[model samples]
Target: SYVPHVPYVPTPEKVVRRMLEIAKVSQDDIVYDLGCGDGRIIITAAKDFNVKKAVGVEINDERIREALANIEKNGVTGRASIVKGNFFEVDISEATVVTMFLLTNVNEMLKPKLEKELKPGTRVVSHEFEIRGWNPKEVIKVEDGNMNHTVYLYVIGEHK
Candidate 1:
């Protein structure tokens, strides 16, 4: 079966924190995670980084249900929320930082949306895959005691 949505692969908690760490997230930041499975990344941003707002846009109904429970369990109901929709269609222009754990092709497909909607200084980080034509400002590979995970960071206007 050919599906555009990447099958769910839960990102390690260590890697999740690491992504936010690398992003240098602060309380002033509004973070969005595309294709957020269980909403761990946004929850982490709210709990650990104290971000102003943490939002997730996910297409899967099951994942959205789990993500909502995760938000409640993590006790970040005010700071974090999830929207069940195609990530591409959701308005992410307000995001100061964006994170994803999607396939390369999906990242490539999302490039134009990021370019069009995000402000000039917005930061984007994708785990494992990168935008095909654009170059990352920084690429970090972290070994979380099991295997290495790659994180690519791109600052809007600066990268392209």
Candidate 2:
């Protein structure tokens, strides 16, 4: 049996739009996207939401290169950064707001790190996935035909 892995799929623009809206992203927020793929999340976070700044972490060389190219193309060099590295190996100790579109178990793997490393009020927004031990503050349903998806908001101490 030949099974092909899904090629990198950038989040639909409308979905990113909704996620940004639900997150209440602002010009003062520092956004980081793990496994950032084509850097869409970081780009959108910076360009659309007026985020203070943004960064992306992706392990694939080709993808990271593409992300860098996209950042240049977006004219957000002063507002965004793309790093080439394993998502698990990077420490997000300084980020206040994180955006992710990874699988559920990936969030599970990040739970301890996020809890231990981030300050008490750090926020996380996930698309189509949720952390195992945390309760979301809100969930938004965005429908865009092929891009219908849910966004979740979780604040570090918002839930017991």
Candidate 3:
């Protein structure tokens, strides 16, 4: 059940900065940003941290298109790429770090895939929602205008 009408929202720079810090992204990491609206997370991970590879997967064709354009405009095509399709359908086993701004249900769907497929130490950072009862390794808060955003990070095996 995809929510079709929600408009694209990029995580504020403050939130994204915290996400990067908590994840401890490195040049050796291969990062994925699921539902990567405008590819900011992926782009930033590559641009700022020099990640080896950054992949952004978005289901919405229009949003994916915009992300691709952003990657091109930012000249990060060498290290970042965008996939236009359902996030669930993409293979993320190779990812060392992943970022998302997804609903709880979406996180639930990804939980099993992560537990079954990803290595024990892989890092998953989510913005605004948790995967049901699981606890994150770290949680952060950011103030943007009047909204307070919550970001969380879960290590693969630890969450289950």
- Each model's TM-score? 0.96, 0.90, 0.90
User: Could you give the C-alpha RMSD of every candidate to the true structure, in order shown?
Assistant: 1.6, 3.5, 2.0
Of the pair 1 and 3, which is ahead by TM-score?
A: 1
Name the lDDT value of residue 135 in candidate 2.
88
- Number of the top-ranking candidate, with TM-score as the measure: 1
What does candidate 2's lDDT look like per residue over 48-159, in tens digits?
A: 8888789898877799889999999989989999877776778887788888888787788788877887787888889888887788999888889865688889988784
C-alpha root-mean-square deviation, candidate 2: 3.5
Q: Which stretches in model 2 have alpha-carbon errors above 4 Å?
A: 1-7
lDDT of 3: 0.85
Q: Alpha-carbon error at 122 in model 2, in Å?
A: 1.4
Assess candidate 2 and give its TM-score to the true structure.
0.90
Candidates 2 and 3 compared: the better one by lDDT is 3
Those runs of model 1 whose alpha carbons end farther than 4 Å from true positions after fitting are: 1-3
Q: What would the per-residue lDDT of candidate 3 be over residues 1-160, giving only the tens digit for each residue? A: 3643445778887788778888999999999998889888999998998999999988778788888998999899999998877777778889999888877777777777777678888999988988787878888787877989888889987875
The digit string of per-residue lDDT tens for model 1 on 71-122 reads 9998999999998888888999999999999999888788889999999989
Error of 1 at 66 (Å): 0.8
